[PDB]
Design a protein around this ligand. Structure first.
Ligand SMILES: O=C(O)CCCC[C@@H]1SC[C@@H]2NC(=O)N[C@@H]21
Ligand SMILES: O=C(O)CCCC[C@@H]1SC[C@@H]2NC(=O)N[C@@H]21
Ligand SMILES: O=C(O)CCCC[C@@H]1SC[C@@H]2NC(=O)N[C@@H]21
Ligand SMILES: O=C(O)CCCC[C@@H]1SC[C@@H]2NC(=O)N[C@@H]21
Lengths: 113, 126, 112, 112
């Protein structure tokens, strides 16, 4: 019930100069049980090493009438650590991110809030 | 040139007049170029008299840690539907979203909405 | 109704056709109401036949730590009426501002 | 190396445990340098043992129309030391502020 489909993209040929790896993904907050009529997108980068991390900023847009569109979108920032990109990650809110990074640049997985 | 996109949309939107929430991502790598960055668009599909996809976006570039404070640009794009621009409105979000769109910069957004929440297609910035 | 705003702007902008960087804050408290929140507009002034102030804004409400993840709204406002004057945006809010030689912005904001 | 800041904050915040909404602006010009940009920080003050100011910010650079699409950076800064005082963020930047009884924020900012 708390898990939702995610899909995204990442730079499958990142710079070799110490730069992180650019990526982003989306969750539409509808599953077979619940629907919040909203979607969040996370835009960020993967930073490998001992303390592998995914540092992001996100936009959460809710479906609204035109009259309420001015307040349709929340903005925030999430940092994820692994429990490379493929794997199970957790953020500071305790949300769980299960992800697979295809060789073609695709991000597929699930998110649980 | 053209880059793959993938994303998600609310496949059972509200019926109270609210728009349909959606989002998608482009990694700016194809087989010809790589900008080492990705943009995510978060927004909603609005139907009716003036169909639009209204978005805010975040463009994150790969950077060193010292430069991570400035890795992300923010902006907003409004998309107008050009193929087909004419619609009765039947088909719900899938029909409303599916097709070719252009934003205020003249970029081209070609997307298919289906399979209960999936968005696929191509993006071409101007 | 009306709220105090204060801000800053680049008092010596490039002359290469670039706009003038600026920003201002409204804390949504006046004598009669308090939404326990503040909006900041970050943007640029573009002078011309039809002068414009193009902005992105962040609206942070005071929240508990538990609700801090959803404390901040983001959006964009475009204002129509160099900087000194009365402007209105696409929601019909009224921005009344004075640009000082020091880079200061002072005025009042009234949201539709 | 310092730049003037001005802003606003909620001078009568909720008493429910909520933080204090605030915002401020820096136009990046002083008497020695001008980056032709402005940053606005929007966020809230959280009192207590370890007080903090948690923010999101927008840095808008003056640009020509063609470059306007990339005019604005977005980020988040967390400051540690009431609001009046000397604060530093996670970059090592220094924020020196005075919170006025009228809801004003006045001070100087120095980026790392
Ligand atoms: O309230 C909704 O509309 C759905 C819940 C979304 C939870 C958000 S997405 C950004 C942030 N990061 C998380 O892990 N959870 C919140
Ligand atoms: O410069 C890059 O790193 C890749 C190109 C980014 C183009 C951006 S994405 C947001 C905005 N909307 C568009 O249609 N184009 C720009
Ligand atoms: O609701 C609040 O917490 C205070 C009113 C906020 C109105 C917002 S500020 C950004 C946007 N631009 C406007 O003119 N109005 C809204
Ligand atoms: O070069 C500029 O355009 C002006 C200096 C910008 C420094 C930025 S403001 C946001 C972030 N937080 C800081 O302490 N420094 C950077």
């Amino acid at each position: 019930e708390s898990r939702y489909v995610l899909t995204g993209r990442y730079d499958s040929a990142p710079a070799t100069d110490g730069s992180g790896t650019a990526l982003g993904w989306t969750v539409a907050w509808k599953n077979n049980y619940r629907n919040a009529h909203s979607a969040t997108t996370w835009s960020g980068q993967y930073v490998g090493g001992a303390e592998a991390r995914i540092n992001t900023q996100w936009l959460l847009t809710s479906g609204t009438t035109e009259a309420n569109a001015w307040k349709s979108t929340l903005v925030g920032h999430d940092t994820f650590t692994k429990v490379g990109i493929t794997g199970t990650w957790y953020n500071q809110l305790g949300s769980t991110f299960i992800v697979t990074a295809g060789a073609d640049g695709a991000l597929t997985g699930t998110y649980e809030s």
